[PDB]
């Protein structure tokens, strides 16, 4: 993929901040020193250094964020491979000045799907934190075999019988889970028009963000807006359920 390689190279060059003011090199040193695996990057820096990269990141959030995270992992490996080996993936959060993407749940129209949005709102729902499995390990007493099965982020089959029908006992401890939560955010009553009912939107929080925001707090969520699918079925209505896959949650 020439496009993905170019994106990753540009992102890595940006993160390679030694000739410049050394801001993001210091930020990576910070994240490694304090033992966290998520980086916060100001979009204004992307605009100042490469407008094309910033526009691509904002308008096509998913693949651009994947490339940015892979470049981040490569850079942290270069600065330190010992720490980089500890975490399977290095995540990224965004912030700054989102020109037209900065909206509220009311203004959040379908035009922003697959884009980067920095919404501001009042938190209404915070669901219980659940561990979503990402990698299961199953041990067969009969065959002495340990089988690992991955679970890609498709936001399904859980093996229980061996090849010749030997029961598999899942290895919870060796299995890998990521904590996950869903919150519902609402437009601030102050800025909402006085007449009609409040307009809200969902937000999905992965690890490092499951409890960053509590119910009834004014927050700013930066993330990707996409459509959820229905379950398997012959017939479907054109309707789609949309959520905001957060890349960063900040207290206003």
């Amino acid at each position: 993929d020439v496009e993905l390689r170019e994106a990753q190279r540009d992102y890595l060059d940006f993160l390679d901040d030694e000739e410049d003011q050394g801001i993001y090199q210091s930020k990576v040193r910070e994240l490694i020193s304090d033992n966290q695996y998520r980086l916060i990057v100001n979009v204004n820096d992307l605009r100042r250094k490469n407008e094309k990269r910033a526009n691509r990141l904002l308008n096509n959030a998913f693949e651009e964020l994947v490339a940015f995270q892979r470049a981040l992992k490569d850079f942290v490996a270069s600065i330190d491979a010992t720490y980089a080996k500890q975490y399977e993936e290095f995540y990224v959060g965004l912030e700054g000045s989102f020109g037209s993407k900065h909206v509220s749940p009311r203004t959040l129209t379908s035009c922003f799907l697959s884009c980067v949005v920095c919404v501001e709102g009042i938190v209404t729902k915070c669901s219980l934190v659940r561990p979503k499995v990402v990698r299961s390990v199953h041990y067969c007493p009969a065959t002495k075999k340990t089988i690992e099965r991955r679970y890609s982020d498709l936001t399904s089959v859980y093996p229980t019988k061996d090849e010749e029908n030997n029961p598999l006992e899942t290895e919870y401890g060796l299995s890998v889970y990521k904590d996950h939560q869903t919150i519902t955010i609402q437009e601030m009553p102050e800025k909402a028009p006085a007449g009609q009912l409040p307009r809200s939107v969902d937000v999905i929080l992965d690890d490092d963000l499951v409890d960053k925001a509590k119910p009834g707090d004014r927050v700013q969520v930066v993330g990707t807006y996409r459509c959820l699918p229905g379950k398997k079925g012959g017939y479907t209505s054109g309707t789609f359920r949309t959520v905001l896959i957060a890349c960063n949650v900040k207290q206003m």
Binding site: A194, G195, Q196, L197
Partner: protein
């Protein structure tokens, strides 16, 4: 009810030159007496002329009526007759015993299961008549809603998400009982009724129905009701009142076509009358006369002209409207002020009141005084 050649019929008796008495006697024919109340209800039915000079001075063309009286006097009968005879007329009670309430709201209709905006009763009578029985037993919110409707001729809803303002240009005909179940003339009207001053200030006619012991009237009413009972048994199932269907045809035609203009009103007479009433009312510790009384007199004069389809208010129309307005205003006063204003303005209050009526009233007063002296 869109007929033709009945314009000839309506005009045929419109020139009778005494149709006013006929129509005033053709209201609720099942109710004996209460002629003044019937006149007031006729004027309310025909209504005034709504006018909004420029767009900043909204003046209602309606004639709201309030019948306050001790029980057993057929007030609810008048309200039910108006319900029966006037199109777009709805009936509601201060209690919750009415099908539709005074206040707007939104909900899923119990039978249709559909989410609808239940507009208040006043709105349903947008261009008709709203009859309010038990006017003195409403809720706080009901009182607020009636106040809003009577003041600004519209209702503002912000219940669920519906920030709207829908207009209710209704004529309110209300019935009520005095505080304590009996009207005491020694107290002014505004204090022996469980209604705040702003509410009463928006009614154009106040009818004080009093049940005073009188052998002749008692015998007459007994004969009336007992004859009704006789004639409606299951086995057997000074002008001439108009038939009810023709009466409502006349009401429709007048209320839809003729729009009298008061280009012939004698401003001199009205101004002198108003100044005299102001001076007299303030000379005593009594409720004064205000501009809204002149407004109500104008509306009633226009309505009386509409009854006769004159298209131009005439001196007699103005005099009759003044008679009605002064009768209401005087009867709202306390006992002493009642006689004060009666004697001071007897000339105005006697318009179109022949000698026989006044003489009979005076003879009845004298004989009642004699009876009281006898039986004490």
């Amino acid at each position: 009810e869109l007929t033709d050649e009945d314009v000839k019929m309506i005009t045929s008796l419109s020139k009778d030159q005494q149709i006013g008495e006929k129509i005033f006697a053709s209201i609720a024919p099942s109710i004996y007496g209460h002629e003044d109340i019937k006149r007031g209800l006729a004027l309310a039915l025909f209504g005034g002329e709504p006018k909004n000079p420029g767009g900043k001075h909204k003046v209602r063309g309606d004639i709201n009526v309030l019948l306050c009286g001790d029980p057993g006097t057929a007030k609810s009968q008048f309200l039910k007759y108006i319900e029966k005879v006037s199109s777009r007329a709805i009936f509601t009670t201060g209690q919750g015993a009415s099908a539709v309430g005074l206040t707007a709201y939104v909900q899923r209709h119990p039978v249709s299961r559909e989410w609808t905006l239940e507009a208040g009763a006043l709105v349903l009578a947008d261009r008709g008549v709203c009859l309010i029985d038990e006017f003195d037993k409403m809720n706080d919110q009901d009182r607020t809603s009636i106040h809003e409707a009577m003041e600004q001729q519209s209702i503002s809803i912000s219940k669920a998400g519906i920030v709207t303002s829908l207009q209710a240009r209704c004529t309110v005909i209300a019935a009520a009982n005095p505080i304590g179940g009996r009207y005491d003339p020694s107290l002014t009207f505004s204090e022996n009724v469980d209604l705040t001053e702003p509410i009463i200030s928006r009614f154009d006619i106040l009818c004080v129905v009093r049940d005073t012991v009188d052998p002749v009237q008692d015998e007459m009413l007994a004969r009336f009701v007992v004859g009704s009972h006789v004639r409606h048994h299951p086995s057997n199932k000074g002008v001439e009142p108009l038939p009810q269907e023709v009466l409502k045809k006349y009401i429709i035609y007048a209320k839809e076509r003729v729009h009298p203009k008061l280009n012939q009103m004698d401003q001199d007479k009205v101004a002198k009358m108003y100044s005299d009433l102001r001076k007299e009312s303030m000379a005593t510790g009594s409720i004064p006369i205000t501009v809204r009384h002149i407004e109500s007199m104008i509306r009633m004069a226009e309505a009386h002209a509409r009854i006769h389809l004159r298209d131009y208010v005439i001196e007699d129309d103005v005099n009759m409207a003044i008679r009605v307005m002064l009768e209401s205003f005087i009867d709202t006063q306390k006992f002493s002020v009642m006689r004060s204003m009666r004697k001071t303005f007897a000339r105005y209050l006697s318009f179109r009141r022949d000698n026989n009526e006044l003489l009979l009233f005076i003879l009845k007063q004298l004989v009642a005084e004699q009876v009281t002296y006898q039986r004490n």
